[PDB]
Design a protein around this ligand. Sequence first.
Ligand SMILES: *[C@@H]1O[C@H](CO)[C@@H](O[C@@H]2O[C@H](CO)[C@@H](O[C@@H]3O[C@H](CO[C@H]4O[C@H](CO)[C@@H](O)[C@H](O[C@H]5O[C@H](CO)[C@@H](O)[C@H](O)[C@@H]5O[C@H]5O[C@H](CO)[C@@H](O)[C@H](O)[C@@H]5O)[C@@H]4O)[C@@H](O)[C@H](O[C@H]4O[C@H](CO)[C@@H](O)[C@H](O[C@H]5O[C@H](CO)[C@@H](O)[C@H](O)[C@@H]5O)[C@@H]4O)[C@@H]3O)[C@H](O)[C@H]2NC(C)=O)[C@H](O)[C@H]1NC(C)=O
Ligand SMILES: *[C@@H]1O[C@H](CO)[C@@H](O[C@@H]2O[C@H](CO)[C@@H](O[C@@H]3O[C@H](CO[C@H]4O[C@H](CO)[C@@H](O)[C@H](O[C@H]5O[C@H](CO)[C@@H](O)[C@H](O)[C@@H]5O)[C@@H]4O)[C@@H](O)[C@H](O[C@H]4O[C@H](CO)[C@@H](O)[C@H](O)[C@@H]4O)[C@@H]3O)[C@H](O)[C@H]2NC(C)=O)[C@H](O)[C@H]1NC(C)=O
Ligand SMILES: *[C@@H]1O[C@H](CO)[C@@H](O[C@@H]2O[C@H](CO)[C@@H](O[C@@H]3O[C@H](CO)[C@@H](O)[C@H](O[C@H]4O[C@H](CO)[C@@H](O)[C@H](O)[C@@H]4O)[C@@H]3O)[C@H](O)[C@H]2NC(C)=O)[C@H](O)[C@H]1NC(C)=O
Ligand SMILES: *[C@@H]1O[C@H](CO)[C@@H](O[C@@H]2O[C@H](CO)[C@@H](O[C@@H]3O[C@H](CO[C@H]4O[C@H](CO)[C@@H](O)[C@H](O)[C@@H]4O)[C@@H](O)[C@H](O)[C@@H]3O)[C@H](O)[C@H]2NC(C)=O)[C@H](O)[C@H]1NC(C)=O
Ligand SMILES: *[C@@H]1O[C@H](CO)[C@@H](O[C@@H]2O[C@H](CO)[C@@H](O[C@@H]3O[C@H](CO[C@H]4O[C@H](CO)[C@@H](O)[C@H](O)[C@@H]4O)[C@@H](O)[C@H](O)[C@@H]3O)[C@H](O)[C@H]2NC(C)=O)[C@H](O)[C@H]1NC(C)=O
Ligand SMILES: *[C@@H]1O[C@H](CO)[C@@H](O[C@@H]2O[C@H](CO)[C@@H](O)[C@H](O)[C@H]2NC(C)=O)[C@H](O)[C@H]1NC(C)=O
Ligand SMILES: *[C@@H]1O[C@H](CO)[C@@H](O)[C@H](O)[C@H]1NC(C)=O
Ligand SMILES: [Ca+2]
Ligand SMILES: [Ca+2]
Ligand SMILES: [Ca+2]
Ligand SMILES: [Ca+2]
Ligand SMILES: [Ca+2]
Ligand SMILES: [Ca+2]
Ligand SMILES: [Cl-]
Ligand SMILES: [Cl-]
Ligand SMILES: [Cl-]
Ligand SMILES: [Cl-]
Ligand SMILES: [Cl-]
Ligand SMILES: [Cl-]
Ligand SMILES: [Cl-]
Ligand code: NI
Lengths: 964, 709
Amino acid sequence: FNLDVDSPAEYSGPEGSYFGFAVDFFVPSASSRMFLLVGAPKANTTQPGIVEGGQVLKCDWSSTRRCQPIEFDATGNRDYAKDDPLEFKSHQWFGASVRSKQDKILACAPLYHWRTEMKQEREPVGTCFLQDGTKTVEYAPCRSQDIDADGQGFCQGGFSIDFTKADRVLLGGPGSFYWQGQLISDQVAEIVSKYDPNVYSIKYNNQLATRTAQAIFDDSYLGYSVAVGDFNGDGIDDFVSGVPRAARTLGMVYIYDGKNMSSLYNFTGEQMAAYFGFSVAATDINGDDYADVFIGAPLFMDRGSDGKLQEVGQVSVSLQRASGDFQTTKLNGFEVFARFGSAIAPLGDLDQDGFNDIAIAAPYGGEDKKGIVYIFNGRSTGLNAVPSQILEGQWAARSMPPSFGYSMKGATDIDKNGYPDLIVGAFGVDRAILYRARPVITVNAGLEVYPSILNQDNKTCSLPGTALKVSCFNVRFCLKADGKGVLPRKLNFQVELLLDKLKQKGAIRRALFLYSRSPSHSKNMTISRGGLMQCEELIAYLRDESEFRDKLTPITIFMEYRLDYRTAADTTGLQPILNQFTPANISRQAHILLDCGEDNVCKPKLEVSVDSDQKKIYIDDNPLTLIVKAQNQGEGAYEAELIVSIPLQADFIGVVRNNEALARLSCAFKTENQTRQVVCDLGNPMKAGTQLLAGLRFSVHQQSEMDTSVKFDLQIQSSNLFDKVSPVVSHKVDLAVLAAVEIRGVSSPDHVFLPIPNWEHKENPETEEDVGPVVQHIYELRNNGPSSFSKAMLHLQWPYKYNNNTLLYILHYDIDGPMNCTSDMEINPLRIKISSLTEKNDTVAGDIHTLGCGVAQCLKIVCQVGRLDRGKSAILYVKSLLWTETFMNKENQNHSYSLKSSASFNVIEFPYKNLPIEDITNSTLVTTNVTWGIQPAPCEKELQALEKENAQLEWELQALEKEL
Amino acid sequence: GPNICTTRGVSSCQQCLAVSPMCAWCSDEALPLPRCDLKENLLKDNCAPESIEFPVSEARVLEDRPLSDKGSGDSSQVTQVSPQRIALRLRPDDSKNFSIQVRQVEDYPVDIYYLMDLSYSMKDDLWSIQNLGTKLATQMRKLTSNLRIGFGAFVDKPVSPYMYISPPEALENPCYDMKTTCLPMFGYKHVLTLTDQVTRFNEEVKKQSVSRNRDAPEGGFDAIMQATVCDEKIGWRNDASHLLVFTTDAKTHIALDGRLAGIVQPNDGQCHVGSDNHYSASTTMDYPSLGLMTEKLSQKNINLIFAVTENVVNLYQNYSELIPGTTVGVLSMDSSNVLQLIVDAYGKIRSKVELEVRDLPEELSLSFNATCLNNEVIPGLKSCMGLKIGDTVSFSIEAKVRGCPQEKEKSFTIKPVGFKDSLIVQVTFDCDCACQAQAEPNSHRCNNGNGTFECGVCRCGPGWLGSQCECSEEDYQDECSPREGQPVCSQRGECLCGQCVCHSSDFGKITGKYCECDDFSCVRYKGEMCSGHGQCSCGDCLCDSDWTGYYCNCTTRTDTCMSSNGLLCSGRGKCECGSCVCIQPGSYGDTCEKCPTCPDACTFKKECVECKKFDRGALHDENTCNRYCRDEIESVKELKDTGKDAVNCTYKNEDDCVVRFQYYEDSSGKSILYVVEEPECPKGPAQCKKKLQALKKKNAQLKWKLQAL
Ligand SMILES: *[C@@H]1O[C@H](CO)[C@@H](O[C@@H]2O[C@H](CO)[C@@H](O[C@@H]3O[C@H](CO[C@H]4O[C@H](CO)[C@@H](O)[C@H](O[C@H]5O[C@H](CO)[C@@H](O)[C@H](O)[C@@H]5O[C@H]5O[C@H](CO)[C@@H](O)[C@H](O)[C@@H]5O)[C@@H]4O)[C@@H](O)[C@H](O[C@H]4O[C@H](CO)[C@@H](O)[C@H](O[C@H]5O[C@H](CO)[C@@H](O)[C@H](O)[C@@H]5O)[C@@H]4O)[C@@H]3O)[C@H](O)[C@H]2NC(C)=O)[C@H](O)[C@H]1NC(C)=O
Ligand SMILES: *[C@@H]1O[C@H](CO)[C@@H](O[C@@H]2O[C@H](CO)[C@@H](O[C@@H]3O[C@H](CO[C@H]4O[C@H](CO)[C@@H](O)[C@H](O[C@H]5O[C@H](CO)[C@@H](O)[C@H](O)[C@@H]5O)[C@@H]4O)[C@@H](O)[C@H](O[C@H]4O[C@H](CO)[C@@H](O)[C@H](O)[C@@H]4O)[C@@H]3O)[C@H](O)[C@H]2NC(C)=O)[C@H](O)[C@H]1NC(C)=O
Ligand SMILES: *[C@@H]1O[C@H](CO)[C@@H](O[C@@H]2O[C@H](CO)[C@@H](O[C@@H]3O[C@H](CO)[C@@H](O)[C@H](O[C@H]4O[C@H](CO)[C@@H](O)[C@H](O)[C@@H]4O)[C@@H]3O)[C@H](O)[C@H]2NC(C)=O)[C@H](O)[C@H]1NC(C)=O
Ligand SMILES: *[C@@H]1O[C@H](CO)[C@@H](O[C@@H]2O[C@H](CO)[C@@H](O[C@@H]3O[C@H](CO[C@H]4O[C@H](CO)[C@@H](O)[C@H](O)[C@@H]4O)[C@@H](O)[C@H](O)[C@@H]3O)[C@H](O)[C@H]2NC(C)=O)[C@H](O)[C@H]1NC(C)=O
Ligand SMILES: *[C@@H]1O[C@H](CO)[C@@H](O[C@@H]2O[C@H](CO)[C@@H](O[C@@H]3O[C@H](CO[C@H]4O[C@H](CO)[C@@H](O)[C@H](O)[C@@H]4O)[C@@H](O)[C@H](O)[C@@H]3O)[C@H](O)[C@H]2NC(C)=O)[C@H](O)[C@H]1NC(C)=O
Ligand SMILES: *[C@@H]1O[C@H](CO)[C@@H](O[C@@H]2O[C@H](CO)[C@@H](O)[C@H](O)[C@H]2NC(C)=O)[C@H](O)[C@H]1NC(C)=O
Ligand SMILES: *[C@@H]1O[C@H](CO)[C@@H](O)[C@H](O)[C@H]1NC(C)=O
Ligand SMILES: [Ca+2]
Ligand SMILES: [Ca+2]
Ligand SMILES: [Ca+2]
Ligand SMILES: [Ca+2]
Ligand SMILES: [Ca+2]
Ligand SMILES: [Ca+2]
Ligand SMILES: [Cl-]
Ligand SMILES: [Cl-]
Ligand SMILES: [Cl-]
Ligand SMILES: [Cl-]
Ligand SMILES: [Cl-]
Ligand SMILES: [Cl-]
Ligand SMILES: [Cl-]
Ligand code: NI
């Protein structure tokens, strides 16, 4: 917000040269002359027989704006042989990437070609030119005896570059290894010391490089963008590179160790083709000294309010937690096709607030699609969502869009003003702009009025110039200022005070100063940085009762303060700016007491009470209502307002205007300093004998894992001198534990029909087909309630056998969840191999005798459940095989049974230790009905009848026996 | 009773009308003590009827054409949407409901432009489609009697690194080293314009050849964009089905891939194909952004189809999901099954109708209740699935405007994706009273020109607190309170000249007759007032576009409730405020997609078999069988082992007969039901005394043994 858009410096280059496609600062250090560096890849050079060879210009910032091209290579294309060019520098796009550190500068030509030095060919290996002080050498690692696509032949090294605090170079090239991409790092020392002009392919003793991977990673474009930052213990800067086409063009960002080039972390885009990893940057925004990551996805499409997809681009902000677990948030663009997130530029600490800031660009954003750059300030919590400033492009599209902001570099104080500056560039219009930061001035103002309440009959102080005594008082206003950087220590201010501001021209002004005889005070006050605040006070009085009839309206004392930006300049005339968020003015108010009668002294006498709801708050966000009764027992109370201190667990959802009995009150939420408050207007003033009753709602979510209750502190406040406040009421609300845990079950299939198609008994069963069909019983334990439980137990009763008959043969059992189980019997004793199906689709949308584990031989499976929170569960899949011969043998012929499998659970512990834990348990059974078909109807008749009755009567008896 | 129009709109007419659509204003005569009140209430106050400023939101149908049964008629205009034009009038913060009907007519003419990847890997594919034109043409006789076709071709941006730059014989013949030969490289080229003559097509197929290129990913998007935006060269017909088919065996390049080749100019969505029939900006301009492609496809109403080989099917599956009105199919390596893919894909497109909106003002929002079959109504939804030809669908729309914008007139379009016909809504706004134009600045009617007189009321300037701009700190009372047993102006002001003067807090603006309103009274959801999706007025959150609820924390959106299968909450829940509310027991998740304990697939599909095949069951009774069971189902002689994935199912129907079938999930991504054609059903057709007695003995015992309990 402090950047000066008033009169920025503008630099230009040859039209069609893409001047301003790449930018960076040049700081030789040793407190030395400053320059700007601008790359122009399509700039026609003087190099013999080379068109648009590209060049990087050094723009003089001081005074005149003139760019002087820095020539790394004046020669043309070297020769492999007579009439056989070795290289091709035409359209090599030199200056497409430029980076500078100290007295070192590196520019590259990603489109530089190569003859392979073996056969006649044109391979874009790319090249670069390093210049350190008096030495200038060519650096081209991808140019080697490893050629063609499979090699580094098409690497295009130098596409993106950057330095490290260890003076090591990080250069990436997408084309290496069938466009898998590659990251190459070299010590600057070696780059120059190992340089031989007679040698085209150079080897470096110490070089870090990514190796060829599987063909599946082809066309990933690793090295599309690069940035540096340390993400592990060592102080070594680690490599960060965007990989836009990685993961089926979903986009990724690879991070390699600065030491052994070993992969540390990875990132992946949410949307395909969004080009997640187009650009990358690293800075510590929250001032935790841990480098925070930023990834651009210009083509990302968020969903508008209508639910329609719209391309606004997106930038993911990942904070580096010491633990190593990145807490990441996303940031969508503000316009369509603006391609927000094309450029991410560290600004360092721009406002010197103690938190590094940053800038994001949408080169095609803004009306006329010129370009826009958004600035974002960092803080404790992290990077502030909304931008604090916006930059606009001043040039239009001839043919190519201006592309303003497509490339930018900040975080450097060029004017020595103490604040960093920003270089932005538009290659579309072949221009470049510098933005100088203005000094930020934080300011604190104050206003006091005593006595606030005024007895019209006081008449203490005497009105000068006459024998009249008037009711007077004191007014005290203060101004403290401070700031950092280059600026005059003394700062003048034009302060104006008006009494009874509410009454404007046309209406009488009820109050004026004791001397000036006017409700206006003009003062030229100059203060210095620090706690040298002045704070002057004056005496003002009130007109006679017989000069007006209005004693009701509160007299508002208004103060306004504005500095002179002209006399606050620093160097070339750069005008400062106040802190982004500072009150332009502040005002207090006085009042006139009356009807107090004899004593002429009003005693508010305010009381406040809160009725206990009796309703325990359960651990989600639970609705909570609080009854409040505030009564004014004594005389009037001015500026009466109910103030309430809520804990961290509480969020104020709003006031209750639903109930008629409850008076509708206006209330707002106020958070000052570290205090968390709720302010409600009780009337100004709150007349005598006034009793109100209302209610407030809150949505509360537990903060501390274990808490007995949540305390609230309530009181009433007034601007009066005496009894200006009421007692403080502490009302605690006990937290309860509510966990609605249910257990569900099912049988797949739930109904089996006999006989089994093409089934045959096996004296020695082997496969599933030899035994019978697959019967899966599935139980799920889910915790619905707001509260969570830490541990629980689950018991299963399985219909193991009936009269030494296998019934259901459990083959295996699987689990998804924290639960761990044990069977009291060996699962699948016969060691039958598993075949049939864990995956995919649940999204698709003889009478009867039950064989319970109580009436049949039982197999038990006990399970220990872990922690289950809201909407979380644990599942047990029991896969079994129906033992066919069991139902084909003995009493089993025409009878139908229901195989019952019971399962119960019980919660043993809870994560909340300071609360009265309540045990909870329920149970459920799963039945699988086995039925015979095709036998309902066609001496012998009466015979068959009694045969069925008999058989049925046998089973019912067998049941009662085993049930007792 | 004491409506808000009395309290909040007493200031002036324009304000009164803004208070609520139910508020009216009397702009004539004079009757001291509510100039802003309900229409009927003002009549009881004897306010001249013709002096009542009371706008009314209305939506008139400007053009109502009947739908067509067939689209092959050249004797009349084809209508697929009704109505075509609607004039919409709206009040501040008001809403109105209107409807729109859509139908896919029979025998509707079609445009099919063929676009093929000519990479060397697709060499064989060219020879296989030499007779495709006519062979398909005969197959299209049944679908329509009107059809035009053409052809186009693409390779990739003819530039390094994508193209072989050296040796010189390479750029002329990339297959110089390869056996035989091959054409040079080119971005995209137009061959045959959409024409009714199928003959000339096949002749061109032979005429065209194949080309090789390094780096498998191709530049198809350039061809897609151009073919879409270029109407003349391709020859897309109005009132015709626009079908663009895209065949490739490899990946595809995406926007920003051009920067490697030194291309920094975004796609402009403009046609750069000339009389040479080649993409001019192929080398100069970068690959199109998907958003741009979506936009143009939508505008030109082109249905894009992805015919892609198995390996890339998944890649284009995800891509297609980002672009509405697009399908994905598996193109065989030999490009033999393409013909089938065409007919099938067409069926998928005409099985669904989706609506889109263009040029919708930011202040205006829309709601929907989709009616697909019979009494089926689906709130929030703007499309329908599983349809046929000649089928008609309806949509109940409700437009809700936030405030009353400045501009007088706006025009936004609502249309089916891919269809030419549409509904153009002309919207206007009444923010002002007719008496406002008749205002009298500083008229003598208000204290000798010390106040302005409009809409039958004097709006006084600063300094005068009384009506007619008379009294300033004089001796007067009136009513500054609703009743004598209530405070003055809610202690937010006092009675001066018989009127309440509201204070001004640092929090916001106190307004209203009795100073009972403000900007900060409104409820706050989480950390923000009205969830930040609404602006507060007198303690009332007014939700912005596409936002609803008391706290404005409930969106009108639906897409978040859609499942992978294309159903709302997987059909096991209802969408509320963007999130699915699961109904089916044991079901949960974002789209209620997770249901471990709900019945097995066999239990769900037994109803589908019972309906589709047996025309009965609980499913058939509700006539939802057709939309529910989208699984291809056929009667098989015997149930066979199709896969480890396949599941053999068995159940007893209403006829007490055993029915067997199976369910297949996979095999390229289509579900099928195979039902055994012959369900098993019931079969129609001395010593014995000792046997009966033997059982009688048992019965006597068994009965007597019944005890205990
Ligand atoms: C951030 O994201 C990054 C990107 O996603 C992640 O990086 C990834 O990290 C993983 C894990 O290390 C890597 O997987 C590794 O791949 C190695 C491949 O090495 C290539 O080159 C060598 C020659 O130098 C070949 O030998 C390799 O084999 C090829 O051919 C063989 C058959 O002969 C085949 O088996 C391979 O799949 C491969 O074939 C492919 O590639 C060829 C071309 O080379 C194609 O023609 C072909 O079509 C295929 O596409 C390969 O070419 C591999 O060597 C590593 O092996 C480890 O794991 C395997 C698992 O099976 C194991 O067998 C192997 O050996 C073990 O057993 C041996 C005995 O048999 C023991 O001797 C040995 O000690 C081991 O116990 C190793 O264990 C490994 O799989 C990814 O390559 C890498 N991706 C990229 C792009 O960088 C990164 O992990 C992530 N970071 C974080 C923090 O999440
Ligand atoms: C788990 O299991 C469930 C249930 O089986 C799966 O749910 C299925 O999801 C798929 C998508 O993944 C759905 O396919 C849709 O098909 C419709 C086509 O409309 C219907 O009616 C048509 C009338 O002409 C008919 O032709 C169609 O028949 C096809 O599909 C059936 C299978 O259902 C197949 O048997 C036939 O051979 C045909 O192939 C069909 O009945 C389509 O409109 C949907 O969208 C398509 O079109 C849009 C618009 O152009 C496009 O944007 C989409 O990309 C797509 O091309 C969609 O394709 C299917 O309906 C669901 N099946 C059922 C019966 O509910 C689920 O996928 C599984 N989950 C997982 C993750 O594994
Ligand atoms: C009738 O009106 C007269 C004239 O105003 C009034 O006399 C005033 O009395 C007040 C209160 O006693 C005096 O204010 C004091 O000023 C001293 C410095 O001179 C302050 O230190 C005192 O308080 C300190 O702490 C306070 C805590 O709140 C602060 O508010 C204050 O800033 C100081 O830090 C105290 O405020 C004042 O001096 C006179 N005014 C004059 C000009 O004589 C008298 O009180 C009124 N009589 C009745 C019956 O009300
Ligand atoms: C660097 O120096 C190079 C020296 O050759 C420059 O090359 C020139 O670049 C142009 C394209 O920008 C080449 O293209 C020509 O374009 C014209 C078409 O232009 C028409 O209109 C112009 C007037 O605007 C008119 O002068 C022309 O006659 C045309 O009517 C074609 O007609 C030409 O045949 C040709 O294709 C030029 O060939 C080329 N000029 C030279 C000297 O050969 C290059 O532009 C410079 N690059 C930068 C960025 O500075
Ligand atoms: C759904 O039910 C279908 C019908 O029952 C199942 O079809 C079965 O599929 C399996 C393979 O998945 C086949 O299993 C094979 O069986 C043959 C038997 O033939 C042998 O013996 C016969 C005489 O009985 C003789 O004529 C032959 O020459 C052989 O000597 C075995 O030889 C194989 O090794 C293998 O086990 C079944 O044959 C087949 N049954 C039928 C009737 O089609 C299907 O599996 C079920 N679907 C799923 C996936 O659940
Ligand atoms: C889009 O691509 C994704 C992979 O990036 C596909 O997801 C896979 O789908 C197959 C089935 O076709 C599963 O077996 C894999 O487990 C999935 N992989 C991952 C990582 O999710 C997906 O199929 C493609 N399109 C869609 C959405 O169907
Ligand atoms: C106060 O002093 C400044 C110079 O410091 C002068 O310009 C200004 O006019 C003075 N203000 C007034 C109106 O007293
Ligand atoms: Ca490191
Ligand atoms: Ca950090
Ligand atoms: Ca900062
Ligand atoms: Ca600076
Ligand atoms: Ca008193
Ligand atoms: Ca290619
Ligand atoms: Cl630097
Ligand atoms: Cl997310
Ligand atoms: Cl979203
Ligand atoms: Cl656990
Ligand atoms: Cl807020
Ligand atoms: Cl609402
Ligand atoms: Cl609600
Ligand atoms: Ni050499």
